[PDB]
């Protein structure tokens, strides 16, 4: 149950859905309709689709309308019937979504065309987001894509992280599970196999394929900095070697310069870099200077 | 009067084309200076 | 607001200066320089077209 | 897997992704729209492109919006319908991006083509940046680059660090592991190496090599200094030459003079300049004395 | 490896490359916009390259965004497709760029063409610089510079400090290494090597030179002020004549004026000095008058 | 544009000074001194952008840019 994790079949993807719509119900925490013209319009508008002609000149202060946005993932394979859940945020001046409806609202995609219809019940968690807030099932499929899965004999597996020996375990995996010539390897991220002409016997091959183990090779070392949540994560290929390191009110536990072992492992590491008693914030900047300097054998990425 | 040939005070060509740089040298430096003077 | 351009012989229409109406004034917040802040006693600000 | 570690494949490379969005559901944390005009024109945008077309002449004032710069990166061998993290980062007087969700935003080249579309919703840590936030797979790969892999016999390996006696080394590892002639050095950065023809080979190939385990020679001595963020580091080569020290507020522990002895290795080095009582302030400037007077044998690099 | 310490490779340079940029998501501590006009003029012209056409006449006031000059180093023997760190600074009246992120930003050369592009998230301390920043991988390299490493038979070594006697050692060190004419010296600061043609040899040349031990001779004696800073280094080869010193507010531990002694060694010149019970400011003054006078054996450079 | 205020704080404008070396050849590396030239309070953590540095007969024998090391 390993492939399955580490790759993604071709054709097999999803899409995003977008749409507008308005949510009512609210208990006096919509828009106000003032400063949001769109609300009044696009309420005149459903008006007079149902029936309903509200005079151009008119006042109209609304207080539990809110104008929202509505977006969906397509899921791969989707038939028109099924239903999907959304996300409905808030676009201007709205105090809370907590106990609102959303209207029928047609979810478009990157052609402009019309693929899912939504309506629902949002609930919203109530330090907790008020202007967004998730439907559960809440919008129905109605456009189905084509697609040419079943149609030839090979279809690519696509790894979520490159590595050609990632890949050459993939492609021998398969081989070992599935005969001589199941599968080829065409660059760092991409396994070809073949599979029988058809439909069933695609689907089959795939059932069997997605559930293989494959022992996961050792990665690149890699330390991972977040300067705005404040976090540093190093992974267990990081190493380090013996240089000193000194900063502002950081000492020996005396001098102001501080060494560091060559450390192999992961908890040799965590041990040196614990022995200088450095705050997260204190130590993103040592692993950026011992970055530059060359002790740090890893990629520092700031993300 | 006006048809007669006449000299203009500011003779020959009233513009001039830029000479195309020279080929820079193989050396492994980014800043390459024209024959100086 | 309208604005003569020399020219021109029709004024040009720049912007409506809207005013905004409360229903209950009194219980304005006065912030001092001649200025006055919504307050939960005056809510809901309504910005209308004068005269109506 | 150390090669992985010190050099990158020729043409297994990353490129950078940008593009403009509109960030909805925050509370009340958006644009003031009043000093952006851009955030308005766009949602006006939006909405005529869903089939509202709210008049010219109208006074917008948002809340729950803000206009947003996205960022992300395109990976080596990027498959359409593939996934990749985006960073979503506000452009213009916004307070707080904690709870929004990213509409769809088109991620352009520096050839101004469309390589992915972004949308998902934001995670923000909330001492915590508020204007900036992460997603997770928030984009997914909609062109694909062309590549010259699997063409020809050469491929080449390019050192992070320039060193001709590393790429001695990395040159004689693999002539040591697989035939005489298997690679060459090009340069103090490059190495040349014989590869069959085809992709699969190939990406055999590259999955022995990378690895593959070499030894580490020693570098060039280096001192680094970040007087942004007040640290020293010196790396394992650094050595130090007997001279007299002086500085403001520094006395033997006596006279304002201290002797330095001669250090051969780190540890040496380090207990002559932790003897000195110097804040790593003080530090610094004692370090530039030195490189200039000549007792530091290293590289004073001021980051 | 001590040779790689002591010379440089002819041809084995760094450039400096310059851009400039935006940096977005600060939490309100970017450019008033008002006093930087460029911040915004760039802004307009990176939304009308990607497609908004903000109107000429219109107030923008931005809180998030701050107008930056970005600063690289490109390496030896560079290859596009590699990443290098960058350096991040403010331009005009920005408060901080603590969460920042880093645009596209096309770094240029002397010749003004574009050598890399820069993209990524600012890391900053936070006593510390808020205005500055680095990336660590931030500028992926997108040329490549023409060289003529590998043509001819000779290659120079330059050493950092000019000096006949090292100079000579060098040389006579690849003699008694690698056979009779091998290197020959040029001047005080040039030595040229003879080494077989092609590239891969050459390779090989240089490792085995460069980590050759080639030991130290004595330099000159020099004694290095930092009045800016308040230091006075000096170094092994500093020697003292006996002569009277007297100075402000110092006496015998009695007289002002105080004898110092003929000193031969560091030692000793640094016991003759803490003698006199000076301020390192007073041995500044101290030294510079004895330096005058004729005492000090050294020679005086003022950093 | 020529009429447009600005009114910067991040910037100073310095002079660059610096040692030619005997027998200085192309690709060395030599150190420089920043110093601030009008009504500028500060230059603790700035950065020097790209300087030509020219001789007695106005010609550039070197390129300055880096970080500046102020005491403090």
Redesign the interface.
């Given at each position: 149950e390993r492939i399955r994790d580490l790759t993604?079949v071709?054709?097999?993807?999803?899409?995003?859905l977008?749409?507008?719509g308005l949510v009512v119900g609210l208990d006096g925490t919509g828009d106000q309709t003032?400063?949001?013209?769109?609300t009044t319009?696009?309420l005149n508008?459903m008006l007079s689709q149902l029936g309903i002609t509200v005079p151009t000149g008119t006042?109209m202060?609304l207080?539990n309308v809110a104008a929202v946005?509505v977006?969906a993932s397509y899921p791969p394979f989707a038939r028109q019937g099924q239903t999907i859940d959304v996300?409905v945020?808030?676009?201007?001046?709205?105090?809370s979504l907590r106990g609102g409806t959303l209207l029928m609202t047609p979810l478009?995609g990157?052609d402009?065309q019309v693929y899912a219809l939504a309506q629902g019940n949002i609930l919203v968690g109530g330090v907790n987001?008020?202007?967004?807030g998730r439907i559960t099932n809440g919008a129905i499929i109605e456009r189905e894509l084509p697609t040419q899965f079943g149609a030839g004999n090979t279809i690519?597996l696509?790894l979520?992280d490159?590595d050609?020996?990632m890949?050459?375990?993939i492609?021998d995996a398969i081989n070992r599970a599935r005969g001589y010539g199941s599968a080829?390897?065409?660059?760092?991220?991409?396994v070809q196999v073949r599979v029988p002409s058809g439909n069933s016997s695609q689907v089959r091959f795939l059932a069997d394929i997605q559930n293989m183990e494959v022992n996961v090779?050792?990665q690149?070392?890699k330390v991972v900095?977040?300067?705005?949540?404040?976090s540093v994560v190093m992974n267990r290929?990081v190493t380090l070697?013996?240089?000193?390191?000194?900063?502002?009110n950081l000492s020996?536990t005396?001098?102001?310069?501080?060494?560091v072992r060559?450390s192999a492992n992961l908890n040799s590491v965590v041990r040196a870099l614990n022995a200088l008693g450095a705050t997260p914030?204190d130590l993103?900047?040592?692993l950026?200077?011992?970055?530059?300097?060359?002790?740090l054998?890893?990629?520092?990425?700031?993300? | 009067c006006a048809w007669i040939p006449a000299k203009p005070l500011v003779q020959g060509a009233t513009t001039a084309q830029p000479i195309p740089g020279p080929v820079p040298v193989a050396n492994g430096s980014i800043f390459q200076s024209a024959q100086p003077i | 607001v309208s604005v003569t351009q020399q020219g021109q012989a029709a004024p040009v229409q720049v912007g409506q200066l809207n005013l905004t109406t409360f229903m209950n004034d009194t219980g304005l917040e006065s912030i001092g320089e001649n200025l006055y802040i919504e307050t939960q006693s005056s809510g809901?600000?309504?910005?209308?077209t004068p005269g109506?």
């Open positions: 993604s071709q054709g097999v993807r999803e899409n995003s977008i749409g507008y003032t400063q949001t013209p769109f319009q696009t508008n006042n202060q207080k946005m977006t996300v945020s808030s676009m201007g001046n709205a105090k478009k990157v402009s987001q008020l202007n967004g690519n696509q979520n490159e050609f020996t890949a050459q375990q492609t080829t390897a065409l660059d760092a991220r991409t090779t050792p690149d070392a900095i977040n300067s705005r949540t404040g290929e070697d013996s240089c000193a390191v000194a900063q502002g020996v005396g001098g102001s310069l501080q060494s060559s914030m993103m900047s040592i950026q200077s011992m970055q530059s300097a060359g002790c054998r890893a990629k520092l990425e700031i993300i | - | 809901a600000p309504n910005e209308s109506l």
